[PDB]
Design a protein around this ligand. Structure first.
Ligand SMILES: Nc1nc2c(ncn2[C@@H]2O[C@H](COP(=O)(O)OP(=O)(O)NP(=O)(O)O)[C@@H](O)[C@H]2O)c(=O)[nH]1
Ligand SMILES: [Mg+2]
Length: 167
């Protein structure tokens, strides 16, 4: 197909849940066991083929540490989609993700497409967040949910493509 679409996507979530790893996996096909905490935000782009449309993602990978919270609107204002990420081995990171969802629903664009990534799914032997519980939470709040693993690549391209399809 010859159609071309471009959308702005932002990743939000508690520090260490794997936002930069998810983006690096999707954009560069890389995964680093040792990834330094992001300062402010990082920016990357990736273009994919969806049906007869070429979709380019402009991705803002935000730093999740609390000291950067006040910068968040600079990154999510104007975003057409967001991926809120938590770590399936850490319930507090899941609670933090719910508060990011609330902030987006109240302060971001009214028509933003919000996805929820239960990341580090490869560490299911240390699970702290029940899959069905997270799926129900996502369903009830109109969020596109998938468990992902930036480490193994599980559902990484899938979550970005599912978002593209809904934009
Ligand atoms: N097992 C596993 N480790 C992962 C996964 N995704 C990220 N990690 C690891 O978790 C750590 C932090 O990842 P990183 O992507 O930097 O997290 P972040 O959410 O960007 N942190 P910040 O918000 O501070 O920038 C790294 O050691 C990374 O290798 C995953 O899917 N599985
Ligand atoms: Mg990061």
């Amino acid at each position: 197909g010859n159609k071309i679409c471009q959308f702005k996507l932002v990743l939000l979530g508690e520090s260490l849940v794997g936002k930069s790893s998810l983006v690096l996996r999707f954009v560069k096909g890389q995964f680093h066991e040792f990834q330094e905490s992001t300062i402010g935000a990082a920016f990357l782009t990736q273009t994919v083929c969806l049906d007869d449309t070429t979709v380019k993602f402009e991705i803002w990978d935000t730093a999740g540490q609390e000291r950067y919270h006040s910068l968040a609107p600079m990154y999510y204002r104007g975003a057409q989609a967001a991926i809120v990420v938590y770590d399936i081995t850490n319930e507090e990171s899941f609670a933090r993700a719910k508060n990011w969802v609330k902030e987006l629903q109240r302060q971001a664009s009214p028509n933003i497409v919000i996805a929820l990534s239960g990341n580090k799914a490869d560490l299911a032997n240390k699970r702290a967040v029940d899959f069905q519980e997270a799926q129900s939470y996502a369903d009830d709040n109109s969020l596109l949910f998938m468990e992902t693993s930036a480490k193994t690549s599980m559902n990484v391209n899938e979550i970005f493509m599912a978002i593209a399809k809904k934009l």
